[PDB]
Amino acid sequence: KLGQHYLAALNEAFPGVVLDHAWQTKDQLTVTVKVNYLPEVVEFLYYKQGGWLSVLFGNDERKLNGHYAVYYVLSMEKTKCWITVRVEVDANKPEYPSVTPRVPAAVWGEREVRDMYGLIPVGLPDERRLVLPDDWPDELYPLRKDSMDYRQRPAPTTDAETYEFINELGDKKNNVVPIGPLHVTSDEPGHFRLFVDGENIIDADYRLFYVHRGMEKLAETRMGYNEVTFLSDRVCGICGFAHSTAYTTSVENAMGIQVPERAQMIRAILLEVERLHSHLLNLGLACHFTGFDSGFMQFFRVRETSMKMAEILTGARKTYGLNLIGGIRRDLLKDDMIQTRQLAQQMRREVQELVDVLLSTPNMEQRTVGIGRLDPEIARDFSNVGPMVRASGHARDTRADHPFVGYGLLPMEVHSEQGCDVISRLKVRINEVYTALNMIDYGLDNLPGGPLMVEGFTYIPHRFALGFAEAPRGDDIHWSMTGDNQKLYRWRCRAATYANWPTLRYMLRGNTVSDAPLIIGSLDPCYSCTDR
Amino acid sequence: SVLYPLIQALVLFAVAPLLSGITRVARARLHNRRGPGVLQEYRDIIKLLGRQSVGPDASGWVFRLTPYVMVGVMLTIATALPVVTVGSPLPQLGDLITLLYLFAIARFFFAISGLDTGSPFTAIGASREAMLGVLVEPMLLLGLWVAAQVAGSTNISNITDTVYHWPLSQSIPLVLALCACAFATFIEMGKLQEGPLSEYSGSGFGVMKWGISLKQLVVLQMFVGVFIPWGQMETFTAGGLLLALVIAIVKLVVGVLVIALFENSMPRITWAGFGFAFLAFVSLLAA
Amino acid sequence: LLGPRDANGIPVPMTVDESIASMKASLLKKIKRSAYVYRVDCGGCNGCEIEIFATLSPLFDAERFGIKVVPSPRHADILLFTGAVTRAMRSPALRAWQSAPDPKICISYGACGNSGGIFHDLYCVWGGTDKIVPVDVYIPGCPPTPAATLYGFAMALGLLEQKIHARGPGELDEQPAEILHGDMVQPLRVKVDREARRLAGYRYGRQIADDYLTQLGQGEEQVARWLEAENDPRLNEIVSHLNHVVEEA
Numbered sequence A: 001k002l003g004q005h006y007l008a009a010l011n012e013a014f015p016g017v018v019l020d021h022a023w024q025t026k027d028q029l030t031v032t033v034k035v036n037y038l039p040e041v042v043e044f045l046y047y048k049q050g051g052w053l054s055v056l057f058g059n060d061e062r063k064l065n066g067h068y069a070v071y072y073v074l075s076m077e078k079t080k081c082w083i084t085v086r087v088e089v090d091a092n093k094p095e096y097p098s099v100t101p102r103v104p105a106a107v108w109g110e111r112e113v114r115d116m117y118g119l120i121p122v123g124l125p126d127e128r129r130l131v132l133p134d135d136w137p138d139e140l141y142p143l144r145k146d147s148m149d150y151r152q153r154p155a156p157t158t159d160a161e162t163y164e165f166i167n168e169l170g171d172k173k174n175n176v177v178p179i180g181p182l183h184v185t186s187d188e189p190g191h192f193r194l195f196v197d198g199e200n201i202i203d204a205d206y207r208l209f210y211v212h213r214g215m216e217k218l219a220e221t222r223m224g225y226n227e228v229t230f231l232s233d234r235v236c237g238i239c240g241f242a243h244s245t246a247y248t249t250s251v252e253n254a255m256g257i258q259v260p261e262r263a264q265m266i267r268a269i270l271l272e273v274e275r276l277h278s279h280l281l282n283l284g285l286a287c288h289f290t291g292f293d294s295g296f297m298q299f300f301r302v303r304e305t306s307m308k309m310a311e312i313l314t315g316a317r318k319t320y321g322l323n324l325i326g327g328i329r330r331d332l333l334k335d336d337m338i339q340t341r342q343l344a345q346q347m348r349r350e351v352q353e354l355v356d357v358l359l360s361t362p363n364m365e366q367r368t369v370g371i372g373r374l375d376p377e378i379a380r381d382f383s384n385v386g387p388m389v390r391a392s393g394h395a396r397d398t399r400a401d402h403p404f405v406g407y408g409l410l411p412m413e414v415h416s417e418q419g420c421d422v423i424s425r426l427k428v429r430i431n432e433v434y435t436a437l438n439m440i441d442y443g444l445d446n447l448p449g450g451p452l453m454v455e456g457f458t459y460i461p462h463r464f465a466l467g468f469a470e471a472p473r474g475d476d477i478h479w480s481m482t483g484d485n486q487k488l489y490r491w492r493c494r495a496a497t498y499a500n501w502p503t504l505r506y507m508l509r510g511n512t513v514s515d516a517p518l519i520i521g522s523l524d525p526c527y528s529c530t531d532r
Numbered sequence B: 001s002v003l004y005p006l007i008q009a010l011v012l013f014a015v016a017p018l019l020s021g022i023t024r025v026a027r028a029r030l031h032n033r034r035g036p037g038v039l040q041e042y043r044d045i046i047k048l049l050g051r052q053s054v055g056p057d058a059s060g061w062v063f064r065l066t067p068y069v070m071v072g073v074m075l076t077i078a079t080a081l082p083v084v085t086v087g088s089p090l091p092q093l094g095d096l097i098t099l100l101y102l103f104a105i106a107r108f109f110f111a112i113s114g115l116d117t118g119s120p121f122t123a124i125g126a127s128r129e130a131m132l133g134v135l136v137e138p139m140l141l142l143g144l145w146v147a148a149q150v151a152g153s154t155n156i157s158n159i160t161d162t163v164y165h166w167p168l169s170q171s172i173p174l175v176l177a178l179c180a181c182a183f184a185t186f187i188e189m190g191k192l193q194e195g196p197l198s199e200y201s202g203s204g205f206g207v208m209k210w211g212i213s214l215k216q217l218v219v220l221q222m223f224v225g226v227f228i229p230w231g232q233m234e235t236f237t238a239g240g241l242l243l244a245l246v247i248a249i250v251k252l253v254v255g256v257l258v259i260a261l262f263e264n265s266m267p268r269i270t271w272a273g274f275g276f277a278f279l280a281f282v283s284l285l286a287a
Numbered sequence C: 001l002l003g004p005r006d007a008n009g010i011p012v013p014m015t016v017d018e019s020i021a022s023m024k025a026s027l028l029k030k031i032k033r034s035a036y037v038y039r040v041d042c043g044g045c046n047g048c049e050i051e052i053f054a055t056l057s058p059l060f061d062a063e064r065f066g067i068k069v070v071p072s073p074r075h076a077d078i079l080l081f082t083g084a085v086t087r088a089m090r091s092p093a094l095r096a097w098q099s100a101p102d103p104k105i106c107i108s109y110g111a112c113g114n115s116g117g118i119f120h121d122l123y124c125v126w127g128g129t130d131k132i133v134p135v136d137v138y139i140p141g142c143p144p145t146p147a148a149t150l151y152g153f154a155m156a157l158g159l160l161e162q163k164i165h166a167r168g169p170g171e172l173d174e175q176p177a178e179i180l181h182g183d184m185v186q187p188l189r190v191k192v193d194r195e196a197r198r199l200a201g202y203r204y205g206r207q208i209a210d211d212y213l214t215q216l217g218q219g220e221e222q223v224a225r226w227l228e229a230e231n232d233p234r235l236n237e238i239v240s241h242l243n244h245v246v247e248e249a
């Protein structure tokens, strides 16, 4: 059983704090600790044991045990397992000690739980509203199961935005350069405040969650089990198969569900095919701010032949719908599989020539070095997970630590650079394109065979687990608890860029105005995945 | 003395969106797309003239009245540039300082219009355009100043027919000044998103597009009519006029095509534009 | 302040004056040859945004028809609305509405923009884009294909005409339904349909089972067609398993 050593270390460091512990799967572990001793346990597992704060979230278990539940998912990466730290916040006085003064990665999860559930982490410095809009009435906490109906819409208190932006390094003489929410080539709402002195950015604050639909509440009220796979696809058009596989594996880990052999690694094939689509889009956007546009339209061309295998492996463009809880909906056939193999190869042909642009190295040496540097010291604290943390030096990858859809039968390579520039994050994505093309080269020629679907099973109530996938921008951790045979009790999703966002203040600092859209797009944000 | 400058200004006004249209279709063909037609700029300008102009509450008479001022200033420019003869239609206005400071009028009015609105983007674009004018004005002044002291007089239609009859004795000061003027034209027609016209709307935006197209015409025209005059007239006749119009429109078309090509082929040219200008100035002094 | 409200304070769609709305047809025939379109992305997934940006891509072009994307609402004659109106996004969308010069054309793009899509009844959305501003042209899809985007813009500009219309109740409602594939007993057909859906797919499974059904007419002959024509190992495994289900019945 994985995770015994960390539990023993927690027991010897803290003798009588672990009130209860249980195993979800072999590599999944949860512990219930004391409420007043919570920040020491998570800080210990974070700093001393080398754990990364993946996701933390609240729960409404007042009719299950009479208490709120705040979970703290930690990824052990020094074998490698999942540890969740659970606390039982009191009902009529919801207050638990905060982790943000100890672990900086707990700054927005503890701001989200102030809004969705109304729980109060005492000692949290950033007390501003995060997810709910500025016109939201105060005490309506949406994710409380008895606060309001999902269909209720309060009257907007204000038409103007009342958000407060902090200026850490600037003063009352600095000007601001908005870059949202309605900006061209941003293609997605998100506000930015560049506190500039000239063209240099002194400080940078931002307002997000303009695309907060509220699908966490809607996934547990109006919508079932097989239908949330459609909700996960319609979050963003480019992580659709990442969210669906992350949600599906959360529900199949919550029960047994011994999925058939080829239905695992076909999901591994389509997970990598999607990162051909998303990385080559970012590399096209990397050339549209570096300068050349005949490097963009051409990355659009190699993106189209990545869309051509996505046309034949599924038959759809963007949002799809190919996974169910037991297995995959539509199934690949022989010629599709022989064909995808050399269109993978001709892309490796085309990708090599198009990557000869950085070999050219003129705006790819002066515009993309020393710009938007992310400190690996900072990236370790805030627990970034995408190509950000792989460029900064940490070999953080879900497919190597935790093979979820049969990646152990596929050739896995983790690429980590040393520089922390924009050009370093492009080199992460360039080596990931060849890596994903090696898996398409080695996946579709040796399928194990067998069935595709496992259905007819009954959902055991109040069973939960963690589901994870390797999205193109990092990992998405999906935690879902089964409610009954039809509905979910609670489904929580954290986007790949949700962990990535709180370090944009430390990238845009010291840079210029002109390359500031390049710094934001260097990590390839998916606002719709993080805004939920 | 009135008909020739007025017809000059009217034709140079009415041919300006051909040069913008051919530039945008050249940029479209260079990026391997079919692109719009050459008359698309006229359709956009007329359609925007149909629409009604809106602006901020704080904006006053300057915001509405700037585009007409810039178009009129470009017309006062274009009425003194020779396009078909080596003689300017208005030699009184066809000086070197007069043209430069009328361009300064255009820069001043564009900058105060950008600062009239409360938008940060328009004020930023006004500041960048004023920076561009500060860095390009003495480059072009020294280019045509070297060409003028080669010629003898501070006056268009004197530099033009000095470089029409190539002396072959001061050729290096002429060639270096010609390349410096080419660099100044390259800086003015180019950089060297949100844009500085994000607050303009309707008829005001249409007249700004008129003025921008006319400015891009007159900068290239001040290059290719003053420094490339082989194909023009010493005195205005009524029989060789078609050849002059043909060579003028061909010069303008090939100019915008090659400038688009070398713009997409990209403080180097800022220093080299100054460097070739001083290399012209030292050349007379040493020789 | 920006938008009208009820007595409760809930926002309602704006009502343009008829003096302002009287010249929409003249504006359409004015911008028929040159349309200036500003994307107003609201609370929606990138799908409904990247495909709109793909309308000027190499595969599908918009400048050949005169459509040019503008950077400001002040330049806009057509305001393209994309996502479901989030409570945080109603005020910027309204600001983009009043910033544009009157009269305007509004095009709702996608299911999420037409009516809210899958988030139609939810506390943080106001529904579709027609709940805040008037909408002239509705373009459905999730995401709309670029052919649909070109058709929507061409029909908005008058180059094409509307194709689909409403269908109401009629005589065909009460005509009785017929048994489909009513040759063998319904149990086996249902069992082999489920067996093919487990192994192939919804789509592939109906297809394989229906091929098998036409081949139940001649056992050996079309067993042979399914075996030889495809030469697909996978299709052959699907047929063998379906055949064992029917045989054991």
Ligand code: SF4
Pocket: A234, A237, A319, C043, C044, C045, C046, C047, C048, C049, C082, C083, C084, C109, C110, C111, C112, C113, C117, C118, C141, C142, C143
């Ligand atoms: S219409 Fe579909 S793709 Fe577009 S924003 Fe709505 S859910 Fe996303």
Ligand code: FCO
Pocket: A236, A238, A239, A242, A243, A471, A472, A473, A474, A475, A476, A495, A496, A497, A498, A525, A526, A529, A530
């Ligand atoms: N990649 C991606 Fe979408 C985001 N952020 C997910 O997961």
Ligand code: NI
Pocket: A236, A238, A239, A525, A526, A527, A528, A529, A530
């Ligand atoms: Ni995403």
